[PDB]
């Protein structure tokens with residue numbers, strides 16, 4: 001069975017440390033860059049409202065066949081997607097969705113990825129820009145009303161719309177509506193950028209991270225074990241199908257860290273930190289790459 005990797009660092013900053021994100025990320029860097037990913041829990045009273053246009057939120061999610069690599073050898077609203085997502089998970093595990101242990105979904109996910117006897121297919125609302133129906137965070141752009149008690153979140157530095165995105169030389173957040181077993185494979189960001197991820201609500205998002213000092217080790221294991229048909233593909237195209245069990249990387253000496261990102265918690269990925277993961281159930285996430 002799947003052996004869970006060690007847990008990545010979790011930080012619970014005080015209200016003083018929560019004042020500036022870039023200053024806090026720079027301070028946790030000596031530890032967090034050695035694990036690739038880290039989790040940040042805001043103070044208990046920091047609860048931003050959900051500001052998406054729920055009435056008109058409509059999308060067609062992508063189809064994900066979990067074992068498509070091993071096999072080589074519908075429009076929804078937010079409500080209707082949640083109904084499908086909860087029905088899928090409760091039927092699959094034969095129990096209420098909130099009662100399924102996170103370790104069981106994790107163990108079953110990686111079994112289905114390498115299973116040729118069972119073909120499980122899920123859907124992922126992963127191609128949703130914040131310009132379509134608004135960001136999950138409140139913003140002061142006029143397109144939606146802002147209550148007085150919500151203005152601090154529209155101006156907060158932890159609002160992903162207020163993160164610095166311009167790199168020095170001579171973009172808006174994206175949304176993810178997940179269900180059980182919907183996943184994203186191993187990849188790094190463009191220009192080796194940072195990324196910050198916020199789970200607005202729903203069941204946890206399970207993460208796996210590799211520190212940047214082991215990036216070549218991971219790419220070497222990929223070169224050895226990924227399907228030969230995709231071996232000569234460039235990294236940008238290969239990372240569309242870089243599905244690999246974390247234990248396989250750990251067996252080859254690649255350090256891997258995990259975490260369960262729960263509602264209201266941040267996940268930061270450091271430069272050139274390979275990461276992957278899957279969703280425990282119906283949830284809503286927002287992500288953006290930022291610069292330091």
Ligand SMILES: O=C(O)c1ccnc2cc([C@@H](OCCCN3CCCCC3)c3ccccc3Cl)[nH]c12
Pocket residue numbers: 124126176183184185186187188189190197205236239240285287
């Ligand atoms: O789903 C999440 O919560 C989540 C959390 C963190 N990072 C990501 C990245 C994705 C998705 O790709 C979007 C941008 C990728 N980019 C990287 C390299 C330059 C070109 C393209 C994705 C990737 C692979 C398979 C499925 C999906 Cl959906 N989803 C993520």
Ligand SMILES: [Mn+2]
Pocket residue numbers: 187188189195275
């Ligand atoms: Mn990413």
